[PDB]
Design a protein around this ligand. Structure first.
Ligand SMILES: *[C@@H]1O[C@H](CO)[C@@H](O[C@@H]2O[C@H](CO)[C@@H](O[C@@H]3O[C@H](CO[C@@H]4O[C@H](CO)[C@@H](O)[C@H](O)[C@@H]4O)[C@@H](O)[C@H](O[C@H]4O[C@H](CO)[C@@H](O)[C@H](O)[C@@H]4O)[C@@H]3O)[C@H](O)[C@H]2NC(C)=O)[C@H](O)[C@H]1NC(C)=O
Ligand SMILES: *[C@@H]1O[C@H](CO)[C@@H](O[C@@H]2O[C@H](CO)[C@@H](O[C@@H]3O[C@H](CO[C@@H]4O[C@H](CO)[C@@H](O)[C@H](O)[C@@H]4O)[C@@H](O)[C@H](O[C@H]4O[C@H](CO)[C@@H](O)[C@H](O)[C@@H]4O)[C@@H]3O)[C@H](O)[C@H]2NC(C)=O)[C@H](O)[C@H]1NC(C)=O
Ligand SMILES: *[C@@H]1O[C@H](CO)[C@@H](O[C@@H]2O[C@H](CO)[C@@H](O)[C@H](O)[C@H]2NC(C)=O)[C@H](O)[C@H]1NC(C)=O
Ligand SMILES: *[C@@H]1O[C@H](CO)[C@@H](O[C@@H]2O[C@H](CO)[C@@H](O)[C@H](O)[C@H]2NC(C)=O)[C@H](O)[C@H]1NC(C)=O
Ligand SMILES: O=c1ccn([C@@H]2O[C@H](COP(=O)(O)O)[C@@H](O)[C@H]2O)c(=O)[nH]1
Ligand SMILES: O=c1ccn([C@@H]2O[C@H](COP(=O)(O)O)[C@@H](O)[C@H]2O)c(=O)[nH]1
Ligand SMILES: *[C@@H]1O[C@H](CO)[C@@H](O)[C@H](O)[C@H]1NC(C)=O
Length: 161
């Protein structure tokens, strides 16, 4: 099964999370990851015109001012081509995932990486995914802030349940 992961806004974290805060973006798709990682010559080189059709996904690179298409192309190259075989169904899934993320807090949202904010005493979530996973930078016993939404645990749904 595919892991869907995304970035969340945080002015306290340099890079994409800061660029997101400035542009009023809450969630920005990082990738959709099957188990197979692509290696070798891609079956199609992704174009800027193709990658821009993933609406609302922000590049993690400062060089494009956090727009398009360094991260988008990296994702196609490392996780896309050998798994989707054709760019069209891949762009459509990526664009639809971002459209869903743009609507707000997803049904399943689990913290991946945090920046613990001493001032607010919160785990400000900087990256999240649709399934639970071991945490990075999340302070034990502290509540979680997912682009402004306060959650008591790492997920917004019970994982025992
Ligand atoms: C979003 O997040 C960013 C990053 O943390 C915040 O930006 C910081 O804001 C503070 C407060 O305005 C800045 O502090 C001031 O730094 C001055 C020196 O800055 C240097 O220059 C580079 C730019 O080339 C900075 O990026 C570096 O940080 C350098 O250190 C410093 O001179 C200044 O002091 C003066 O003001 C204070 C009061 O604010 C006085 O008490 C003091 O005596 C003196 O007069 C500040 O300390 C900080 O530099 C900014 N950081 C960055 C990386 O940009 C934003 O505030 C956050 N935005 C929101 C909306 O919350
Ligand atoms: C989770 O991630 C996996 C990838 O690991 C996704 O599965 C891929 O889904 C895409 C569709 O979104 C599939 O692409 C289509 O593949 C057709 C050929 O596939 C054959 O069948 C098996 C799978 O049962 C493959 O493994 C073989 O290699 C076979 O070749 C292909 O013909 C088709 O292209 C046609 O349509 C497109 C437009 O839709 C045209 O552009 C094109 O010219 C052509 O007419 C698609 O490329 C892909 O096969 C799937 N890969 C695997 C390994 O299963 C899941 O969908 C993801 N699921 C979720 C929920 O995220
Ligand atoms: C975007 O969100 C919609 C709505 O939650 C998802 O659509 C659901 O898909 C499942 C099957 O995967 C259906 O059983 C539901 O009926 C659908 N709901 C609606 C309201 O259409 C969709 O899968 C999401 N897309 C992606 C790519 O994440
Ligand atoms: C980004 O997320 C924040 C936090 O959930 C959203 O802000 C909420 O917006 C509603 C309606 O505007 C207010 O009633 C709430 O008080 C807000 N919550 C907080 C904590 O500020 C914001 O709307 C989202 N932005 C986008 C573009 O979807
Ligand atoms: O979508 C992204 C890509 C990168 N990073 C951050 O930027 C760091 C390094 O930049 P790079 O190795 O991707 O070039 C990553 O380890 C992570 O801390 C993100 O938060 N989101
Ligand atoms: O299945 C995956 C793929 C990637 N990552 C993490 O996401 C970041 C970038 O993945 P990538 O999209 O560049 O491959 C890396 O820190 C990597 O550890 C995962 O946790 N699981
Ligand atoms: C991409 O998603 C947007 C919503 O963010 C939607 O308006 C558009 O139709 C989608 N593009 C497609 C389906 O090619």
């Amino acid at each position: 099964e595919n892991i869907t992961q995304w970035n969340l806004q945080d002015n306290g974290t340099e890079g994409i999370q800061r660029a997101m805060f400035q542009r009023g973006v809450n969630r920005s798709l990082h990738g959709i990851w099957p188990e197979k990682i692509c290696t070798g010559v891609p079956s199609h080189l992704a174009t800027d015109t193709e990658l821009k059709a993933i609406h609302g996904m922000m590049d993690a690179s400062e060089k494009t001012n956090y727009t398009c298409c360094r991260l988008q192309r990296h994702e196609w190259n490392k996780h896309g081509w050998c798994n989707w075989y054709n760019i069209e169904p891949w762009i459509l899934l990526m664009n639809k995932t971002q459209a869903n993320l743009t609507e707000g807090q997803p049904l399943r949202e689990c913290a991946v990486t945090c920046r613990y904010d001493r001032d607010s005493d919160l785990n400000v979530v900087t990256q999240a995914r649709d399934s639970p996973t071991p945490l990075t930078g999340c302070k034990k016993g502290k509540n979680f802030s997912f682009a402004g939404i306060l959650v008591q645990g790492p997920c917004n749904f019970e994982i025992a349940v």
